[PDB]
Amino acid sequence: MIHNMAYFGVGLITLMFLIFVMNRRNKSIQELAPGILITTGIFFTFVGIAIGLVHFNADNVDDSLPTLLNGIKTAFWASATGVFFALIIKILDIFDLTR
């Protein structure tokens, strides 16, 4: 539902990262993992703004604020979640090179 949209975005990117790390050995899923994780954060940024402005009125800003702030939250939380988990995949890439 609408209010539980920021957690759905974080939960889905977290779930895909868990799927991305259970393989950890294909090396073709891992090369596509940072792009897919970042794309989903962009996806939740697009749909987050879409639901933020779906009930946005320039006159009644106060009544349009709870949905707009929620859309900003799911945009920032998923972008942070997507970049953080894409960075973990990148960090794990070095650890394979060192040893």
């Binding site: 940072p34 970042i38 940024t45 800003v61 604020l65 900003i72 972008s79 970049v83």
Partner: protein, 235 residues
Amino acid sequence: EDYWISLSDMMTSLMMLFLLISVIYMIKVQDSVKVPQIYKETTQGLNHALKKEFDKDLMKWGAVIDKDLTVRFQQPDILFATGSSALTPRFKEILDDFFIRYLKIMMSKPFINNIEEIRIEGHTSSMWEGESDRGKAYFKNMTLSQERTRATLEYIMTSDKINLTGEQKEWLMRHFSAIGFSSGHPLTNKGTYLVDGESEDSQLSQRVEFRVRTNIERKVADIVEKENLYFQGQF
């Protein structure tokens, strides 16, 4: 050329940086934006309520409402005595019927907290009998007007036909002002306040008004200390 993946995230951060900035600006100006809306709702709400209650009584009383939240009373010599502050029985019966319904609108949930002052204003024509001095035609007119204005206020709270409860009287003390005006603020033939190139009247400029002042100055003021408190809160 995989640098575009990182660049798209930088522009995404730049995108929502200005989205929050636009939102933050929108939030912080809501108090300022609401002030014209509060003024519009209260003034038109009071005017509509004043029109609804009294439009059937303007012609009999001689009163006029001109969207200024005031009940202007024309046709002197029946409201007060000729050159005296004594209240005539004609205006006494007018105040009995008018004020009870007038105070009901004033002491209402949407208006009791949006009213700062209710002004009883006694206006007198610029000419005073037996005098030919402009300076002396303004003060003895103010002496009469102040007593006439106070006479109406005295009659309202010291009557036997107005159902003024023991608690409503304190509200009049803290809001009702008996402001006795003088030859100043005249009215032209159209009922509009005088301009630099217009004349005045005598039977229309002599009037008694019941003007309502909304507390929008306080609401504007309360933003100032809130902004000052917010500014002082960061130090």
